[PDB]
Amino acid sequence: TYKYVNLREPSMDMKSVTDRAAQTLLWTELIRGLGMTLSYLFREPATINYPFEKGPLSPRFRGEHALRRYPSGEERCIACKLCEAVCPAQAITIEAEPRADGSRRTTRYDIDMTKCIYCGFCQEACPVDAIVEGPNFEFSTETHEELLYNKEKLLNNGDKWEAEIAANIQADYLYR
Amino acid sequence: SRGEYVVAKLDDLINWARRSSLWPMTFGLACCAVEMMHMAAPRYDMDRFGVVFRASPRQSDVMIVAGTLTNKMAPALRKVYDQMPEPRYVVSMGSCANGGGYYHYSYSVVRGCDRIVPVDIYVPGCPPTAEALLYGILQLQKKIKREKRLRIWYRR
Amino acid sequence: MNLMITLLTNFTLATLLVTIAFWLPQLNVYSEKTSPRLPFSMKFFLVAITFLLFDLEIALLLPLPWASQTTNLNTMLTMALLLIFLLAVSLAYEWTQKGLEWTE
Amino acid sequence: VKQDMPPVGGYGPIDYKRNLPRRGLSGYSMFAVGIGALLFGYW
Amino acid sequence: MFMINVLTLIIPILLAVAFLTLVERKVLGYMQFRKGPNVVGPYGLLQPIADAIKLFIKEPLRPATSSISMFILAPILALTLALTMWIPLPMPYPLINMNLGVLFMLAMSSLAVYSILWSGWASNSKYALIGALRAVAQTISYEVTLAIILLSVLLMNGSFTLSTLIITQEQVWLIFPAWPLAMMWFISTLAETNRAPFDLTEGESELVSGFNVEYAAGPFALFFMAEYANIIMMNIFTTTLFLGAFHNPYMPELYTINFTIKSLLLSITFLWIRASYPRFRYDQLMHLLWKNFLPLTLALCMWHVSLPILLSSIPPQT
Ligand SMILES: CCCCCCCCCCCCCCCCCC(=O)OC[C@H](COP(=O)([O-])OCC[N+](C)(C)C)OC(=O)CCCCCCCCCCCCCCCCC
Ligand SMILES: CCCCCCCCCCCCCCCCCC(=O)OC[C@H](COP(=O)(O)OCCN)OC(=O)CCCCCCCCCCCCCCCCC
Ligand SMILES: CCCCCCCCCCCCCCCCCC(=O)OC[C@H](COP(=O)(O)OCCN)OC(=O)CCCCCCCCCCCCCCCCC
Ligand SMILES: CCCCCCCCCCCCCCCCCC(=O)OC[C@H](COP(=O)(O)OCCN)OC(=O)CCCCCCCCCCCCCCCCC
Ligand SMILES: CCCCCCCCCCC1=C(C)C(=O)C(OC)=C(OC)C1=O
Ligand code: SF4
Ligand code: SF4
Ligand code: SF4
Secondary structure, eight states: OOOOTTOOOOOOSHHHHHHHHHHHHHTHHHHHHHHHHHHHHTSOOOOOOTTTSOOOOOTTOOOSEEEOBOTTSOBOOOOOOHHHHHOTTOOEEEEEEEOTTSOEEEEEEEEETTTOOOOOHHHHHOTTSOEEEOSOOOOOBSSGGGGEEOHHHHHHHHHHHHHHHHHHHHHHGGGO | OHHHHHHHHHHHHHHHHHHTTOOEEEEEOSTHHHHHHHHSSTTTOGGGGTOOTTOOGGGOSEEEEESOOBSSSHHHHHHHHHTSOSSOEEEEESHHHHHOGGGTTOTTBOSSGGGTSOOSEEEOSSSOOHHHHHHHHHHHHHHHHTOOHHHHHHTO | OHHHHHHHHHHHHHHHHHHHHHHGGGSSOOOOOOOOOOOOOHHHHHHHHHHHHHHHHHHHHTTHHHHTTOSOHHHHHHHHHHHHHHHHHHHHHHHHTTOSSSOO | OOOOOOOTTOOOOOOOSOOOOOOSOOHHHHHHHHHHHHHHHHO | OHHHHHHHHHHHHHHHHHHHHHHHHHHHHHHTTSOOOOTTTGGGTTHHHHHHHHHHTSOOOSOOOSOHHHHHHHHHHHHHHHHHTSTTOOSSSOSSOOTTHHHHHHHHHHTTHHHHHHHHHHSSOHHHHHHHHHHHHHHHHHHHHHHHHHHHHHTTTSSSOTTHHHHHTSSSOTTTTOHHHHHHHHHHHHHHTTOTTSOOSSSSSOSSOSSSOOOOOOOHHHHHHHHHHHHHHHHHHHHHHHSOOOOBTTBHHHHHHHHHHHHHHHHHHHHHHHTTOOOOOHHHHHHIIIIIIHHHHHHHHHHHHHHHHHHTOOOOOO
16 A cells, blocks of 8 residues: 655666666667657647637636526516625625515626625526626736626626526536 | 838838847746746746746846745845846736735735836736746737837827 | 958947847836845766866867768777777766766 | 437547657667767867 | 948848848647747748847837947957858858868857957846856866867868868768767767757746846847857757768759758757757756766767778878
């Protein structure tokens, strides 16, 4: 249940001593290393052609956040504040009131994406699949406050990415 | 006229040269170092864009702040930024360099490196993937591509 | 003459490259930046002196490809092997008296 | 039930040991080749 | 007409130095299982141009220098010596055909350490000076075996004339009578140009290459292109010295094609050595010189003195 790395006493007969002296004087392991580097010279490189090729992702991927809707246009978030209760960065800020038809909806739904640790606890805490974390990772900004998302940005991300978000949830909801 | 055309083509030449030969200095402070090292790994391979891996910090173009900036390494960050030759850019990688991140309310963390240095590109994630950082590097290249240094020089 | 022309041309191209590389990046007006004995080692000096003395021994060895053409070949071969042997004896005394240590 | 499982016979054998396959000539042979190249050059 | 010949030497030297950076980044890319540059030009062919234009409009870094005069003269001397090492190279005809081209190149390469020494003086940091003195001690250490290997090989040539060294190798490559000299030559020229695994300035084992150190240094492109001129030149010199090609005096282009292909293979061998090994520690390459290469070099020097005498193969002076 254990093995000894580097507990080999070398053979001291003239054959092995001449082997090690030929290794010293004729640089045999150095030519071995040159041969291994030369072997990688003639391989096809592992380089993908970004942006025209994309790295492989799964339907579980945790990228940009989005607020979703039912298949009626009604937004799924019913202001229950589980996602900011579980948010380990406290990146989520929610206010709420009954809207004009008496429905429990949010007035504020902020996610500071620069506090956010992208761990998907909000999408697993959400009882109505409202907040999800979409597949978008190509959303670098040029200013810090463009990453301080309010509810309108998250609803636009939901409307923007729903055709993909719904298919990824369709692929992964039986594991959840 | 003619001079506007000449300074426009010279802007195009120098912007092409500066964006297509970006040399990054990386503050590999924390976990985002691992993902920049994947952005230099053979799949994504920053070096095929002209973006050499392990450039000298003395002659670097962009400072990639990849990790959590603490209060104890904020003056070293600013010192390395002050030793950079212009034109210098700063890519803030990841949530702790952007805005404090998971350690935003800590006693010992600078809430985003933009309290210390001017930031050009904010790359979001914890960590952002190596593909997302390469997206931010290409957005920095596009930002350099639309610079107008000689056109604004000519119009002043 | 052609050698002097070539040396002047190489010196001129080098000075032109240096003058361009110092004055061409001064075209763009930059933001004027306003923010803000060495220890001796005996081994560093000893490797330089060992270089100098073996380089003088090499200066003795450099006329050998002309010295093989002589008619006094036995004397020439004796003194050639003797200079290379004295270089080797200088190296052996540098070895055994701890002279090649920590810059071995 | 449909779960991520190994197949019926299990997976195949996975190598995990060092394979540095001992290529090259012998120590006598490499010095012989070098001395032969020297003697051909000298001749 | 002669100035045309000087310029058609020295301008393609600079163009070859430009595209050696591309060849380095590509060949080191594919050996590292990735690609080199392929975006900036078609197959990366605009990468040296873009990189040179970037380096020539970049600000002088932060600091000031201890001595203005040596801060100016070190890149001037580095580029001047890097360009004058090419003028006696017989390819098949040297630009300056001199009787002592070998000794000229040995002397002008011995003069090249003053650029390193004066750039160490011209920096303000007392640690960059220590790094420069380590580099100077390395280069002057391997110049010893350069001189003695070069002498031992020229004992089969008959003279210091570089053009005679084509005539010497008309029957066989000179690597066949002198392959231990050839391999210690190749590794010693590798250790001359501060090239990996001997690059201690550009790597670790260094007291000053340590991230947010001082030391105003020169414009990097000039020392860099002097260094790559030296790399291509020492590989062409090794090609002339040990792997000399067939020369038809009515068709010089055959020799030029042949030595060019061999020099490209030998420069790619430099690229392939730097992408294969870790670095020496400083005392380990001092060990490799003083305790390993120099005893074999003195022994083979005695051998190559006494060997044309015992074989009756003393080469002619003319
Ligand atoms: C010109 C074209 C290219 C030429 C060939 C070069 C291409 C190959 C390059 C490979 C990569 C090398 C990268 C750098 C490597 C540096 C490290 C290294 O190799 O160190 C050298 C090593 C150093 O030794 P070491 O460190 O490996 O071993 C330990 C050393 N001690 C014990 C001191 C601690 O070996 C040498 O110095 C060998 C030098 C050349 C040997 C020439 C052998 C001549 C044999 C003659 C016959 C001998 C038989 C007995 C006598 C018979 C008489 C009839
Ligand atoms: C009076 C008229 C003249 C006025 C003054 C101008 C003088 C001439 C200056 C050069 C030409 C000016 C224009 C420069 C390029 C502008 C266009 C451009 O940038 O096109 C982009 C295109 C690549 O597209 P990209 O945005 O990189 O996309 C990523 C890949 N999908 O880019 C490309 O396809 C490649 C662009 C190459 C740029 C030109 C080639 C390099 C410059 C050579 C000359 C200068 C240097 C000489 C040698 C110096 C030492 C080596
Ligand atoms: C000894 C041999 C030495 C060899 C040295 C050179 C090696 C590389 C050789 C060149 C390889 C191909 C280069 C192609 C560069 C890109 C050309 C091009 O079309 O760039 C596109 C860019 C923008 O074009 P745009 O009008 O926007 O097009 C939109 C289309 N609807 O258009 C532009 O930017 C404008 C056109 C720029 C063209 C630049 C071409 C390369 C110039 C390199 C300088 C050296 C030239 C050779 C000198 C030595 C030989 C004589
Ligand atoms: C910091 C200062 C600036 C630094 C940068 C610039 C200086 C450093 C780089 C330049 C070094 C110059 C070296 C030139 C001489 C080399 C030796 C030499 O002349 O060898 C060539 C040749 C010998 O061969 P051979 O065939 O025997 O003679 C011709 C007879 N058939 O002999 C000939 O062909 C003889 C030709 C006539 C004599 C030529 C004399 C040249 C001018 C005087 C020396 C100039 C350099 C002074 C400064 C050196 C560095 C400080
Ligand atoms: C006149 C032509 C000038 C071309 C300049 C190219 C400079 C080399 C670019 C890449 C590079 C390499 C290969 C390199 O080896 C190196 O040293 C470690 C760099 O500095 C950090 C580099 O940036
Ligand atoms: S992914 Fe995690 S850190 Fe980000 S908003 Fe959701 S719960 Fe908060
Ligand atoms: S957990 Fe879901 S429904 Fe509840 S407040 Fe958050 S997003 Fe809205
Ligand atoms: S933003 Fe997150 S993953 Fe990235 S370095 Fe910071 S703690 Fe690590």
